[PDB]
Amino acid sequence: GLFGAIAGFIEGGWTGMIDGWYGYHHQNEQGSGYAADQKSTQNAIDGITNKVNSVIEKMNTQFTAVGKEFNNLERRIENLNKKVDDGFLDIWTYNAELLVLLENERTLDFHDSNVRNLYEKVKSQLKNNAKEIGNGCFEFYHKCDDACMESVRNGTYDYPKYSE
Amino acid sequence: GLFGAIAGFIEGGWTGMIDGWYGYHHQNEQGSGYAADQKSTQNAIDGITNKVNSVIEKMNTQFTAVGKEFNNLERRIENLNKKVDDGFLDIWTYNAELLVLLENERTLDFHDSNVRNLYEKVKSQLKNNAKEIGNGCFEFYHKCDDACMESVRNGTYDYPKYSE
Amino acid sequence: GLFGAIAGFIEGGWTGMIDGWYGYHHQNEQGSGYAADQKSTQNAIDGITNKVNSVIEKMNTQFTAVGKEFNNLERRIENLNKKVDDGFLDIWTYNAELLVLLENERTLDFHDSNVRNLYEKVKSQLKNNAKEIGNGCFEFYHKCDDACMESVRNGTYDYPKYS
Amino acid sequence: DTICIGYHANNSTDTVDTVLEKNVTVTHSVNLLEDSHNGKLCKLKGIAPLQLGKCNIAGWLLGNPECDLLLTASSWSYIVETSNSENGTCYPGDFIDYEELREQLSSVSSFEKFEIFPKTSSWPNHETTGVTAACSYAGASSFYRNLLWLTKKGSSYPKLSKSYVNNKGKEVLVLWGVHHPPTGTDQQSLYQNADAYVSVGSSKYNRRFTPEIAARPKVRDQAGRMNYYWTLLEPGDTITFEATGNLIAPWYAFALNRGSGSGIITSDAPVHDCNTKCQTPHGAINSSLPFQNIHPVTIGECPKYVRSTKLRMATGLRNIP
Amino acid sequence: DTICIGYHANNSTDTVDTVLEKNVTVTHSVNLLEDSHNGKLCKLKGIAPLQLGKCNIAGWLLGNPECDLLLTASSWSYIVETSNSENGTCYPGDFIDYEELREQLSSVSSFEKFEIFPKTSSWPNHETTGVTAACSYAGASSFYRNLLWLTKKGSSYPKLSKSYVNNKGKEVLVLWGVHHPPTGTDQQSLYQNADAYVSVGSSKYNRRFTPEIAARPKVRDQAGRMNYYWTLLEPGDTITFEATGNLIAPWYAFALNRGSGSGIITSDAPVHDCNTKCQTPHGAINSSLPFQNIHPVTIGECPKYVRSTKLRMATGLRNIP
Amino acid sequence: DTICIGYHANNSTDTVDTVLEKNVTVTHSVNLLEDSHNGKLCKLKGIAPLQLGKCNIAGWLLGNPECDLLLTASSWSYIVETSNSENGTCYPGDFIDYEELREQLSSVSSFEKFEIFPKTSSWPNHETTGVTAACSYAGASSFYRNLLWLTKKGSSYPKLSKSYVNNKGKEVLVLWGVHHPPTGTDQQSLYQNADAYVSVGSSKYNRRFTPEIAARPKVRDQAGRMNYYWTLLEPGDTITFEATGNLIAPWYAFALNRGSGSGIITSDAPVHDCNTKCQTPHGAINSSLPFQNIHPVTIGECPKYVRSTKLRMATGLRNIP
Ligand SMILES: CC(=O)N[C@@H]1[C@@H](O)[C@H](O[C@@H]2O[C@H](CO[C@]3(C(=O)O)C[C@H](O)[C@@H](NC(C)=O)[C@H]([C@H](O)[C@H](O)CO)O3)[C@H](O)[C@H](O)[C@H]2O)[C@@H](CO)O[C@H]1O
Ligand SMILES: CC(=O)N[C@@H]1[C@@H](O)[C@H](O[C@@H]2O[C@H](CO[C@]3(C(=O)O)C[C@H](O)[C@@H](NC(C)=O)[C@H]([C@H](O)[C@H](O)CO)O3)[C@H](O)[C@H](O)[C@H]2O)[C@@H](CO)O[C@H]1O
Ligand SMILES: CC(=O)N[C@@H]1[C@@H](O)[C@H](O[C@@H]2O[C@H](CO[C@]3(C(=O)O)C[C@H](O)[C@@H](NC(C)=O)[C@H]([C@H](O)[C@H](O)CO)O3)[C@H](O)[C@H](O)[C@H]2O)[C@@H](CO)O[C@H]1O
Ligand SMILES: *[C@@H]1O[C@H](CO)[C@@H](O[C@@H]2O[C@H](CO)[C@@H](O[C@@H]3O[C@H](CO)[C@@H](O)[C@H](O)[C@@H]3O)[C@H](O)[C@H]2NC(C)=O)[C@H](O)[C@H]1NC(C)=O
Ligand SMILES: *[C@@H]1O[C@H](CO)[C@@H](O[C@@H]2O[C@H](CO)[C@@H](O)[C@H](O)[C@H]2NC(C)=O)[C@H](O)[C@H]1NC(C)=O
Ligand SMILES: *[C@@H]1O[C@H](CO)[C@@H](O)[C@H](O)[C@H]1NC(C)=O
Ligand SMILES: *[C@@H]1O[C@H](CO)[C@@H](O)[C@H](O)[C@H]1NC(C)=O
C-alpha cells in the first residue's frame, strides 16, 4: 500500500473490531478488548460516501428515446445513428471502467493513509512514555488503566502525568 | 488530509506569512517573525500552474456551428441531432465535474505532502540538537541567532557546530 | 516527489544497480556492491504492468466504417456527421492526453512511495543498532558481514543479537 | 500494558478491481452497474404505452379489418409493437413518409378518432360499398374501417367535392388513398372515367393524383395498388378533396396533440401496470445507478449503456482477516 | 529559541468541491467555467453577421417588397434572424430545400445581386406585368423584386427558351418559382395551356415541373400557390429555362463565394461592432476557458457546453486562518 | 560498515509528461499511440476489397466499356476507389440514390452477374444496337455493357412488357435508365411515340417515367440526358418493365447477399494480400493500442483517432544518474 500501513508494518485486520474501520486494541490489568476510533472512522465514512454519491449523482440524464427507424433508402443515416450510439458506448464503457479502477486504488490508499495518520497521532502523544513494538503496538512504560487508555483514544492523554 | 500535516499535526495556517505558501516562524532573543520557503513554494506554484494549464490548453476548439434546422418531415434526424448534442453534453458535464472533484483532492493532497516534506527535512538537519514538540515546532537545545535561523531555512544548518 | 524519497532525501539513482528498480548498496570489511530488492521490485512490476494493460485492454470497439458520402443537397446531415466525428475526436484527444498526464504523475508517486516504504522497513528493523545518515544510508553500530547484510535485505535482521 | 492500532476485517467475499491489482477482496463495496430488468413493459411518465395487438401502426391507422381492437387510450407515452404485429396495409401499395408518421405518433395526448366524412350522408352520388378479398374479415371480402372505397353509381361517377374544417382545437390526422387499377377496363368498370384524377388541398397540402394503369405483380392476389397518404391538418384549416375517380376517401380520422421525444419499442415482453423511468425491450430497469448493460436502445431517463459486466466500487478497505 | 514549520493562510472566501468533501475553503483558486456573456451579437472572424430587418432569408432572397431595405453586406460570417423576421414568401407555397439553402448561405466572402434576365428585353412574346395583392407595397398590388410573373400574351403562351451563361467567376444562385392555379380555368386564363410544363437544366441540374391543380383554401387570400426553387450554377456553366406556362422567372440572381461551417442565430440581442470567437443566441462569450454553461447551440471556436453551475479548481491550499 | 536504500537509474533518454511537470526523463516507458501504418490496403475479415481501377462504382455497375477488364470477386469486405476512378456514367444524367447504393454495396458475400433479359430473345420488335460517342471505347462509339438502348424497329416502337422473377435465393440488384432527348424530333426519330412512358413495378417498387424534352447544355457533347435507377429485388419477388419508349433496359443484373457496416476507401495505396483489423486510406494499422494518429477515416475495429503527436506512459521511475 502507498502509505505502508495496511498489509504494511501492520500486517492484518481485526475481525474482533466490529464497530468501526479504524481503531485500537488495548490490554491492561482490567482486561483487554477492541475499540473503534470514531473520529477517523466517521471522517472516512463521510469522505467515501461523498465519493460514491459524486460518481452516481454527477450523472445527468434527460428523457431520451434512443431508437430510430429508417427505410431501405435511408441506410446512410441509419449507419450514422449507429455510429453515434456505438461511439457513446465506447466512451462510457472505457471511462466507467477506468474511473472505477483508478478510484478503487485511491479508496484503498485513503484507508491506508487513515491508519497511518492514526498510528502517528497516537505515537506523538505517548512519546517516550511508551515503547514502539511494531505491528502497530505500543508498550507503556507506566500502567494504563481503562481510564488512561481512553484518554489516548480520546486524544486527551496527559504526558507529564506519567514518567519513567 | 492524506499526509497528515495541513489540518494535521500542524493545526492551522499563518495569516502572518504573506510571501509564500510554505515557510517558517522563528523565535529567538533577536525577536520573531515569518519567512516563506522560496524553493518549495515556487516548486508548488510551477507544478500547480502546469496542472491548470493542462486542463485548459489540452482542450481542442475548432470552428463549429452546432445548430441545425429541420422541416416538419425531418423529425427523425432532428431528434438524432438532439441525441448527439445531448450525448456530448452528458459526457462533458460528467467528465468535467469529476475531473475537478478528483484533481482538487489531489491538489490539496499535494500541498499537504509539501508541508510534510518540508517539516521532515528540517527535522533531519536539526536531529537531536532540538526538541520536537508537535504543531510543527522545534525547540533548540542551544541559542539560534538570525544567522543560525537562516541556515535552517536555507538547508545549510551546521549540526556539529551546536552539538555543545 | 509526493513521498519525499526519490529526488528527495535520497538525491539520486544507481546506474550501478542493474537488476531491479529498488534495492541496497552495502559496505563492509569484505567489500561493497549492489543488490536489488526482489519483492518490492516485482510487486511494482506487477502493479505497473496491470496499469498499462488496463489502459490498453479496456478499449474495445466494434467494426465501424467512419466515412459517409452525401450529395450537394445533403449539407446539413453532412455537417451533422462531421459534428459527430469531430466531437469524438475532441473527447478522446482530451481524455487520452489528461489520462496520460495524470497517470504518469501517479506512477512516479508509486515508485516514490515504494522507495520510502523500503527505507522505513529497514529503519524499523535496525532501530538504534544503526545510525541514520540522511542519504538513505544506515551506518551500523556493530560489524555487519555479508551474512548480516543479507539478513537486512531479507528482512530477517536480528536486533537483540547485535544490540 | 499495551495499546495497538489496527483496522477492520470481516467475512466479506466482495471483490473489486484496482488499477494496480485485480480481484482485491474488500470489507465493503457498492455496485455501480444495473445488470438486471423486471421482464415487463411498464408505464412511462405514469402512462401506459399504445398496444396494437395483431397490427402495426399502418394497419391501426387505416383500420385493417384484422385489427378491429379499435379502442385506444386518449394518451400514451410510447408505442409497443410485437413479433405479432403483422397486419398493415392489406391492399398493396406505398405508405408515404411512414417512418416520420410513426415517429410523430410515438407519444400523444387528447387522442381521439372521429367520423370525418360519415359514410351514410357524405356521398349521395357515389357507391361506398367497395370491398376486396385482400382485406378480409370473418372469411368475407372487406375493407379498411377508416376509409371508404368510392365507386361509380349506375354507370356514372360525377366529380365529387368534399371539404372538412378543423374546429377540434388541435391537429387532425387525415389519411386517404389513391387506387391504381391494373387495366383500363378495370378503371372504367370502377370509376367510368378514363381521364380520372384525385385532388387534395389545404393551406400546406397541394396535390393532384392521376391513375397509373400498368402491369404489376400480384401482391395478396392484387395486380392493382393503393397508395396511402396523410397530413396533419392544423386547427382552423380546411382540407378539400375533389375526384373524378380512384379516391379511397377518408371515413374516420384522428384528432390529437402530438407529444415529443418518445419512440417505438419492439418487444414480446408483457405489458403491466408498473411504473418505470427507463424502459428496455427486455424489461424495465432501475434508473438510480449511472450505468447499465441491459440494452443500448432505451426509452426514458436511463443509465448510460455500457459493455461492462462488472463495475464495483470499493467503499471499505482491503479485507485481511 | 524555536523554529516552526507552517503554511499560508489568508482572507480568501473561495470554496471548491473535492471528491471527499464539499465546499472546502481554499487560499487560491481558478474558474474553469465560462458563465457570462456580453448580451450582444458580435462579429465573428472580424466579420459582421447578415441582418435582414423585417424579412426572413426567403423574403430577402426572393425580394419580398417589404424587404426593400437595400443594405445587405457583400460578405457575412453568419446570419441573424429575429422575432421580427416576418416577411417571407408573400405568395403562399413551398420553398423547396429551404433549410439546405439557409445552411449553404450561412457564410459568404462575396455576394452580389445582378440582373440575370432583364424584364424589359427578355420576354417579347409573353406578358411580364403580373402582380398580386398577396405581395403589396405602398397599398398597391406588387410582386417579388427578384422574380417575374410571366403570363400569356393576347391568348397565346408560346414555348419560351432562355439561357444564362455564368461568366461571374463564382457560383450564381438562381431562384425561380412555379405557380399552381386552383382550377383548370385559371390555368388557361393565365397560361393558355392545360398541358403546361417548366424545364430547368444545367450541366449538373435537370428538373421538370408541372402544375398541380387542386381546389384549396385561401392563404393570405390566395387560393393559388407558388413553389420556389433554386440551384447554385457553377462558374462557366449554363442554365436553361423552358416553359409552356406557370414559370415565375428569374429577374435578379446572386453571384457569390460561399464560405463554410457557419449557421443561423435566432436572437433579439442587439448586433454590435464587438468581436468574438464564440457566439451564442444570448450573447458572445470568452473562449479561453474549456467549458461554458451559457448555451449548447453556438457558432465559433467555443468552450464545451456543460450543465455545470460551478467548476472551480483549487490552486492554493486549505485556508485555515 | 553501511547499508543504503536506493533506486534504479540508467542511460534512458525517454521522456514523458506529467500533470505537474513537462518532459520528465524516466528509466522505462511505453507508447499508447499507434503512430505508424504499413502503406498497404489489406484484407478485412480475411477478404480483399473490391478494386474498381479506372472506374467508379457507377461505371462498374452499369458496365461502362472502360471497366471491361475489371476482375471482380464473388465477395469483398470493402470497396476501394482511387484518384484514377474517372469512368462513371458516360452518358450524362442523374444516378438516383447513388450514395445509398454505394453504401449498401460496400460489403457483399455471394455476388454474381447474370443475364436478366437476354438480348437475343427479349426484343424482337425493338432495335437493341443503339450506341453513343459519349460512351466510346478504343475510339469507337459504344454503350454500357449491362444495359441496352432500345429504339424503334422500322418506324414503330410497340409497347413492351417484360418480367423477371427472382429465383436466385438472394437479393437481385436491377439497374436501368431513362433517356431524355433534347428535342421532339429526336424523340420521334428514336422512339416514334411522343406520348411515351416507362413503368417499372414489383411487389415493393412502383414508378412511372415520362420523357422530359428540353434544350440543355451539352455534357460530353450530349444535350440529352439519361437518368439511372435501381432497386434491390427480394428473393421470390417479381419486377416488371413496361415501356412505349425511352427505356434503357436491363441486360445484366446482379444477384447478391449484402454484408453490413462497411464502406468505401478512397486511396492510391497498393492492395496487398496482408491481413488487418483496421484499415485507413494511408495504409493498415495495428489495432492493439487504444489510440491512433494515422487517419480520422477508418474501416475496421480500430484504435480511437486522436490529434496527439505523443502519448507515452511512464513505467519506470525518474531517471537520475
Ligand atoms: C372492377 C372489377 O370487378 N374487375 C374485375 C377484376 O377484379 C378481375 O380480376 C380478378 O380480381 C380479383 C379480385 O377481385 C376483387 C377483390 O379485390 O376482391 C373483387 C372486388 O369486388 C373488386 N373491388 C371493387 C370495389 O370492385 C376488386 C377490384 O376490382 C380490384 O381490386 C381492382 O384493382 O377485385 C383478383 O385480384 C384476381 O387475381 C383477378 O384476376 C377480372 C377477372 O376476374 O374481372 C374484372 O372485371
Ligand atoms: C386567373 C384569374 O384572374 N382568376 C380570377 C381569380 O383571381 C378571382 O379570385 C379572386 O382573386 C383575388 C386575387 O386577385 C389577384 C391577386 O392575387 O391580387 C389579381 C391579380 O391581378 C392576379 N394576377 C395575375 C398575374 O393574373 C392574381 C392571380 O389571378 C391569382 O393569384 C392566380 O392564382 O389574382 C383574391 O385571391 C380573391 O380572394 C379571389 O376571390 C376570381 C373571382 O373574381 O375570378 C377569377 O377569374
Ligand atoms: C436521333 C438522332 O440521330 N438525332 C441526331 C442528333 O443526334 C444530332 O445531334 C448531334 O448528336 C451527336 C451525338 O450523336 C449520337 C451519339 O450519341 O453518338 C449518335 C448516336 O448514334 C445516337 N444514338 C442513337 C441510339 O440514335 C445518339 C442519339 O441521337 C442522342 O444521344 C439522343 O439524345 O446521338 C452529338 O450530341 C452532337 O453534339 C449533336 O450535334 C443531330 C445533328 O446532326 O441530328 C439528329 O438527326
Ligand atoms: C409582411 O408581414 C406583415 C406581418 O407583420 C404582413 O402584414 C399584415 O399581417 C397581418 C397578420 O399578422 C395580416 O392580417 C390579416 O388581416 C386580414 C384583414 O385585412 C384578415 O382577414 C386576415 O385573417 C389576417 O388576420 C395583414 O393583412 C397583413 N397586411 C397586409 C397588407 O397583408 C404583411 O402582409 C407582409 N407583407 C409581405 C409582402 O409579405
Ligand atoms: C393479417 O396478417 C396475417 C399474417 O399472419 C395474414 O395471414 C396470412 O394471409 C395470407 C393471405 O391470405 C395467407 O396466405 C397466409 O397463410 C396467412 N398467414 C398466417 C400466418 O396466417 C392476413 O392475411 C392479414 N390480414 C389482413 C386483413 O391484413
Ligand atoms: C435500484 O434498485 C432499487 C429499486 O427497486 C433501489 O432501491 C436501489 O437503491 C437501486 N440500486 C442501488 C444500487 O441503489
Ligand atoms: C474574456 O476576456 C478576458 C480574458 O479571458 C477576461 O478577463 C474577460 O472577463 C472575458 N470576457 C468576459 C465578457 O467575461
Judged by CB atoms closer than 8 Å, whether chains meet at A86 and C59 is answered as no
Residue the block writes with cell 406556362: E245
Cβ atoms of F312 and F321 within 8 Å: the answer is no
| Residue E34, SS3 per DSSP | strand
**Could you tell me the domains of chain C?**
1-163 (3.90.20.10)
The reply to whether F163 touches chain D by the CB within 8 Å rule is: yes
Distance E286 CA to ligand 7 centre (A): 5
DSSP state of F93: S
Walk across the sheet containing E79-81 and list its strands. E50-51, E79-81, E264-266
| Residue B73, SS3 per DSSP | coil
| Contacts of residue A99, Cβ cutoff 8 Å, sequence gap at least 6 | A55, B98
Residue whose CA lies nearest to ligand 4 atom number 4: E86
Cell numbers at F205, concatenated: 417498387
Return the H-helix or E-strand segment holding F302: none
Residue whose CA lies nearest to ligand 3 atom number 5: F186
Query: How far apart (Å, rounded) are the C-alpha atoms in residues D191 and D158?
Result: 9
* Ligand 3 atom closest to residue F133's alpha carbon, by position in its atom list: 18
* Number of separate helices (H) and strands (E) present in chain D: 4, 28
Contact D129 CB / ligand 1 (< 6 Å): no
Cβ atoms of A41 and D7 within 8 Å: the answer is no
**Residues lining ligand 3, judged by CB closer than 6 Å?**
F 130-134, 141, 149, 151, 181-182, 186, 189-190, 218, 221-222, 224
Query: How far apart (Å, rounded) are the C-alpha atoms in residues D160 and B138?
Result: 108
Chains in touch with E (≥3 Cβ pairs < 8 A): A, B, C, D, F
**Closest-lying ligand to the alpha carbon of E217?**
2
Residue whose CA lies nearest to ligand 4 atom number 35: E87
Neighbours of A134 (CB within 10 A): 11
The reply to whether A80 touches chain C by the CB within 8 Å rule is: yes
Interface test with F, best of D89, D216, D228 (most F CBs within 10 A): D216
Integer CA distances (angstroms), F67 to E23, F48, F52, F231, F272, in order: 71, 19, 8, 22, 21
Interrupted after residues, chain E (C–N over 2.5 Å)? none
Query: Amino acid letter at A53?
Result: N
User: How many alpha carbons fall within 13 Å on the CB side of residue A86?
Assistant: 18
| Residue B137, SS3 per DSSP | strand
* Ligand 6 atom closest to residue D30's alpha carbon, by position in its atom list: 13
Classify residue E248 by burial, with Cβ atoms within 10 Å: 0-12, 13-18, 19+.
buried
| Contacts of residue B102, Cβ cutoff 8 Å, sequence gap at least 6 | A103, E19
Residue the block writes with cell 474517372: F86
Query: How far apart (Å, rounded) are the C-alpha atoms in residues A60 and C5?
Result: 42
Distance D197 CA to ligand 6 centre (A): 62
Query: How far apart (Å, rounded) are the C-alpha atoms in residues D71 and D80?
Result: 15
DSSP state of B159: H
Query: How far apart (Å, rounded) are the C-alpha atoms in residues E27 and D88?
Result: 70
Query: Amino acid letter at F242?
Result: E
| Residue F28, SS3 per DSSP | coil
Cβ atoms of D293 and D304 within 8 Å: the answer is no
**Could you tell me the domains of chain D?**
1-41+273-321 (2.10.77.10), 42-272 (3.90.209.20)
Residues of C in contact with D307 (CB under 8 A): 60
Method: X-ray
E-only strand ranges, D76-170: 79-81, 108-115, 132-137, 140-142, 147-149, 160-165
Minimum Cα–Cα distance from B58: chain C residue: C94
> How far, rounded to the nearest angstrom, does the alpha carbon of residue E295 sit from its chain's CA centroid?
20
Q: What is the dihedral of CA D270, D272, D278, D282, to 10 degrees?
A: -10
Judged by CB atoms closer than 8 Å, whether chains meet at A47 and E20 is answered as yes
Judged by CB atoms within 8 Å, which residues 110-139 of B form the interface with A?
A: 134
The reply to whether A58 touches chain B by the CB within 8 Å rule is: yes
**Closest-lying ligand to the alpha carbon of D180?**
1
Neighbours of D178 (CB within 10 A): 24
Cβ atoms of F110 and F170 within 8 Å: the answer is yes
Here the contacts of C75-80 (C-beta below 8 Å, separation 24 or greater) are C75/E100, C75/E103, C75/E104, C76/B68, C76/B69, C76/B70, C76/E99, C76/E100, C76/E103, C77/A76, C77/A77, C77/A80, C77/B77, C79/B65, C79/B68, C79/E103, C79/E261, C80/A80, C80/B68, C80/B77, C80/B80, C80/B81, C80/B84
Judged by CB atoms closer than 8 Å, whether chains meet at A79 and F99 is answered as no
Here the contacts of B75-79 (C-beta below 8 Å, separation 24 or greater) are B75/D100, B75/D103, B75/D104, B76/A68, B76/A69, B76/A70, B76/D99, B76/D100, B76/D103, B77/A77, B77/C77, B77/C80, B79/A65, B79/A68, B79/D103, B79/D261
Judged by CB atoms closer than 8 Å, whether chains meet at E103 and C79 is answered as yes
The reply to whether A87 touches chain C by the CB within 8 Å rule is: yes
Q: Which of F106, F255, F264, F239 is nearest to F176 (CA)?
A: F239
Integer CA distances (angstroms), E36 to A50, E124, F64, in order: 29, 61, 60
Integer CA distances (angstroms), E214 to D166, D202, E181, E227, F129, in order: 19, 9, 8, 14, 44
| Residue C89, SS3 per DSSP | helix
Cβ atoms of A35 and A151 within 8 Å: the answer is no
> How far, rounded to the nearest angstrom, does the alpha carbon of residue C4 sit from its chain's CA centroid?
14
Contact E240 CB / ligand 7 (< 6 Å): no
Query: How far apart (Å, rounded) are the C-alpha atoms in residues A141 and A130?
Result: 5
Sign of the torsion formed by the C-alpha atoms of B132, B134, B138 and B140: negative
Cell numbers at A79, concatenated: 449507419
Cell numbers at F37, concatenated: 501504418
Classify residue B147 by burial, with Cβ atoms within 10 Å: 0-12, 13-18, 19+.
exposed
Residue whose CA lies nearest to ligand 2 atom number 38: E221
Judged by CB atoms closer than 8 Å, whether chains meet at D208 and E217 is answered as no
Cβ atoms of B135 and B119 within 8 Å: the answer is no
Query: Amino acid letter at D154?
Result: G
Neighbours of E33 (CB within 10 A): 21
Query: How far apart (Å, rounded) are the C-alpha atoms in residues E78 and E109?
Result: 11
| Residue B138, SS3 per DSSP | strand
Contact D93 CB / ligand 1 (< 6 Å): no
Residues of C in contact with B109 (CB under 8 A): 2
Query: How far apart (Å, rounded) are the C-alpha atoms in residues E114 and E101?
Result: 19
Cβ atoms of F249 and F127 within 8 Å: the answer is no
